């Protein structure tokens, strides 16, 4: 009987509890490297003279260098792996969630007092979670390295990139393990870990856009100073490992002087009464949603600000029929690529805003299935006064997260060119004309919630189902009749001629009809709980 007894049993339990979520992000984060990034770069940039130009173009744009990082030479690997520098961030996100799912938010639920009343040691749970996360990171690194070794690149750089990707996940596994010991609340620990990740990312980006000395002071940044395909600095790797080791030790110490229930931070009281604004199922929805609106709005505004700078410069450092004058001329504005690229770039923001609008409407299904809709509707609340307080939030939140993004992109474009009073109205209109398409997947979700509540989450599968028709229908073969079954293709284009405004009406009518049926079919529906 040791302090580590029951580690393998707990590890087996943790694998089952997420036997489907783990392989998805292990594969979806490692296999789409050699089949998506290097393949596309080889297609677009055939020879060396077309790659030196791209590298020199990247070196004259801090707004584009800070997001991904520098390019040190013009080889196929170094240019094709540049945009993969975001993976180092994504994997970190993943591992953080995993740890906080299995160590905290398992004590908070009360299950890790029932588990600790069986034959398990004091340190079995933390060790099991650490083993799971370290193994997942090593596995995704190995699969990525194999996939890259199955292509035409330097064989000594694929290994370096795989090891860097593994180490960047191990370090943040360690930081998540340390953060899980700090507060009784899982939300607080998630916030702390993500704050550390965010400040690391910002400290990396500031250094990449400038001299480069500051980027050495961030765990992200140690990963891309290994420089795969550009002359590898191997000694950087054991500069991350050491860090992880230290943090891991600290985690165990913070567990050795703690009780199972909670420890190390007290929470904040503060509201003994309800202010004049919590009396309605409209104020309660505002309280339940404001944080997510803030997060999504900031993210979309920042992404639009990033995309606004790139629009000018693409017109020169791209084109010349480098295999982009064929897909941009179809998906985009069919003309001046400075406007075609803008029209193509705002469709991605529209898709992200649609994904945003789906969540605030699934909040309704979460409320009902949590046995709180019965508590609300057992009062003097109309059945349509409720469900008009989450629909309003979804519509009016996705209608501002897109307009703010358009404003940011317009400001960036105007400053880059020098004239802002000309580009800003057109960019704002381009952002605005995407709303009728984004208000589906809210109309659709409401339609499902009221005819078949249990099949409400399939509204995710619809959204993805639309996206695959946009890409795999315009990037591949099409009968032109299977591509007319998505709302993002019919969005007209602002600026110049051939603005029709007819599809907007046909989408607004469908939105209104779907919402009307989803509301009429819900007020004659037995509240199923």
């Amino acid at each position: 009987g040791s302090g580590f007894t029951g580690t393998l049993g707990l590890l087996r339990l943790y694998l089952r509890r997420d036997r489907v979520s783990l392989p998805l992000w292990v594969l979806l984060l490692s296999v789409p490297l050699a089949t998506v990034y290097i393949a596309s770069v080889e297609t677009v940039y055939p020879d060396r003279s077309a790659r030196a130009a791209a590298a020199a173009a990247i070196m004259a744009s801090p707004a584009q260098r800070a997001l991904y990082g520098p390019v040190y030479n013009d080889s196929l690997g170094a240019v094709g792996i540049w945009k993969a520098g975001m993976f180092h961030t994504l994997i970190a996100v993943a591992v953080i969630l995993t740890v906080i799912r299995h160590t905290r938010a398992d004590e908070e639920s009360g299950r890790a007092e029932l588990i600790d009343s069986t034959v398990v040691g004091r340190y079995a749970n933390l060790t099991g979670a650490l083993l799971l996360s370290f193994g997942a990171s090593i596995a995704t690194g190995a699969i990525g390295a194999l996939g890259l070794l199955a292509t035409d690149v330097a064989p000594a750089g694929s290994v370096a990139f795989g090891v860097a990707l593994a180490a960047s996940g191990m370090v943040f596994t360690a930081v998540a393990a340390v953060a899980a010991q700090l507060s009784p609340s899982a939300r607080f620990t998630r916030a702390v870990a993500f704050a550390v990740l965010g400040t690391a990312f910002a400290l990396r980006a500031i250094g990449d856009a400038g001299s480069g000395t500051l980027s050495w002071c961030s765990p992200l940044g140690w990963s891309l100073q290994v420089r795969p395909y550009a002359g590898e600095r191997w000694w950087v790797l054991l500069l991350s490992l050491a860090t992880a080791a230290v943090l891991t030790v600290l985690a165990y110490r913070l567990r050795a002087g703690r009780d199972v229930g909670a420890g190390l931070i007290a929470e904040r009281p503060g509201a003994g009464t309800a202010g004049p604004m919590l009396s309605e199922p409209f104020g309660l929805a505002w309280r339940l949603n404001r944080g997510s609106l803030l997060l999504w709005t900031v993210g979309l505004c920042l992404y639009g600000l990033v995309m606004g700078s790139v629009v000018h410069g693409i017109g020169d450092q791209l084109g010349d029929n480098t295999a982009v004058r064929d897909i941009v001329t179809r998906m985009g504005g069919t003309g001046a690529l400075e406007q075609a690229f803008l029209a193509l770039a705002f469709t991605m923001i529209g898709m992200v805003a649609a994904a945003f609008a789906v969540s605030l409407t699934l909040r309704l299904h979460q409320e009902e299935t949590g046995l709180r809709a019965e508590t609300l509707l057992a009062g003097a609340v109309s059945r349509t006064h409720w469900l008009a307080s989450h629909l309003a939030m979804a519509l009016a939140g996705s209608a501002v997260a897109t307009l703010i993004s358009g404003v940011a992109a317009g400001l960036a474009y105007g400053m880059t060119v020098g004239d802002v009073g000309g580009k800003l109205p057109t960019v704002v209109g381009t952002a605005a004309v995407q709303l009728p398409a984004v208000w589906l997947l809210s109309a659709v979700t409401v339609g499902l919630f009221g005819l078949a509540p249990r099949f409400t989450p399939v509204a995710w599968g619809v959204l993805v189902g639309f996206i695959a028709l946009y890409l795999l229908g315009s990037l591949a073969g099409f009968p032109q009749m299977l591509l007319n079954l998505e709302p993002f293709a019919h969005i007209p284009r602002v600026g110049g001629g051939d603005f029709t405004a007819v599809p907007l009406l046909w989408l607004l009518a469908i939105d209104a009809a779907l919402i009307t049926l989803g509301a009429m079919a819900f007020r004659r529906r037995d509240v199923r709980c």
Partner: protein, 211 residues
Amino acid sequence: VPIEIRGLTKHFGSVRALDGLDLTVREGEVHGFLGPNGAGKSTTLRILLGLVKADGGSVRLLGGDPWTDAVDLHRHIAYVPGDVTLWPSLTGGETIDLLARMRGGIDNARRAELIERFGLDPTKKARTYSKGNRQKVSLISALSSHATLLLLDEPSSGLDPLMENVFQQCIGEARQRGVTVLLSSHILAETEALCEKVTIIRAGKTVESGS
């Protein structure tokens, strides 16, 4: 007659007759509603609220019927759920005030003393409340409210015997202001202590009734 059901019927799958030939009559008193978990007490309480529609029989809540008049009738009614779940980001006082003014006002004088003697702390977030302290929020929100009819459903679940005694005394105080109560307990000791004229149901029917 606040509640008068006779003939209630409902099939859910249309293979699960939950209700066949149910009866109940209340007049201004405390009434005990006894039966197993699958006998249809939850269905009857959820039909009395507008939540579920009945297939047959007459249901008569405070004169009106529960389905169409589900908004006008709910402002003389308080309800305590069987499975109390709260919003994790709101404090106890915030939840109490919100619930109280979504159903027709609150009585601050009664609310203060109820918080004082149930020993609740209305400043911790509802995420931190234990099993016993979660029930106190619902009990305080329901017992301090303009309501001529209380629909309790396992009202004292997780309460130590002292708070059980306090809750019984509060119900006794309420009973002589003219408030009609439904208990639906599952604990026959408190039902015997508080209620007269119980009614026992087996499958969908009422197999016994009376003082």
